[PDB]
């Protein structure tokens, strides 16, 4: 296995982010918006770069 072959854009956040796979992606964008999710969440999702 290899990962580049699964690269995906973490639509949100400042440091050009390319997360694991589609599902990984979805989830992020999803939660990002469920307003009742600790400020730490967006943060983590955010800055966490490949």
């Amino acid at each position: 296995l290899l990962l580049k072959d699964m690269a995906v854009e973490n639509k949100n956040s400042r440091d050009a982010g390319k997360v694991v796979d589609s599902e990984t992606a979805a989830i992020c964008d999803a939660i990002f918006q469920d307003e009742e999710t600790e400020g730490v969440v967006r943060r983590f999702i955010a800055e966490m770069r490949q």
């Binding site: 730490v40 943060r43 983590f44 800055e47 966490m48 770069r49």
Partner: protein, 133 residues
């Protein structure tokens, strides 16, 4: 000189603020500073001792950055870090001691050791920080 200072507050605020547990953003501003260092260093070779009973030790730099990621720092993250710190500690000790014994009349306020003279170099100034000690 001032250079030297940083090297430490770097490590202290490091061996201190970096521990199994802490949340991410409490090291963001710090982590950076750190890496910045490793970079400037890697490639340059050093030498301490040569006087009296002071062992002549050789130092080399070639360490990987960091996994600027994981949220609530996992144990594993630390240990891979602490291993890198310990080489710098054992380093600085030898650096301090080596410059803590040489005396110069004419100009005795300036750096003496081959170790430090090299630090006052410009290419290193990229490190200085938090001079509150």
């Amino acid at each position: 000189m001032d250079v030297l200072y940083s090297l430490s507050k770097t490590l202290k605020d490091a061996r201190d603020k970096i521990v199994e547990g802490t949340l991410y953003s409490n090291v963001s501003d710090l982590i950076q500073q750190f890496n910045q260092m490793i970079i400037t260093m890697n490639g340059n070779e050093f030498q301490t001792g040569g006087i009296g009973n002071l062992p002549i030790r050789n130092w080399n730099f070639d360490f990987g950055l960091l996994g600027t990621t994981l949220l609530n720092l996992d144990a594993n993250y630390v240990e891979t870090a602490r291993n890198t710190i310990d080489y710098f500690v054992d380093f600085v000790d030898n650096v301090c001691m080596d410059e803590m014994v040489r005396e110069s009349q004419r100009n005795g306020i300036a750096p003496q050791s081959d170790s430090l003279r090299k630090l006052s170099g410009i290419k290193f100034k990229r490190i200085n920080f938090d001079n509150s000690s």
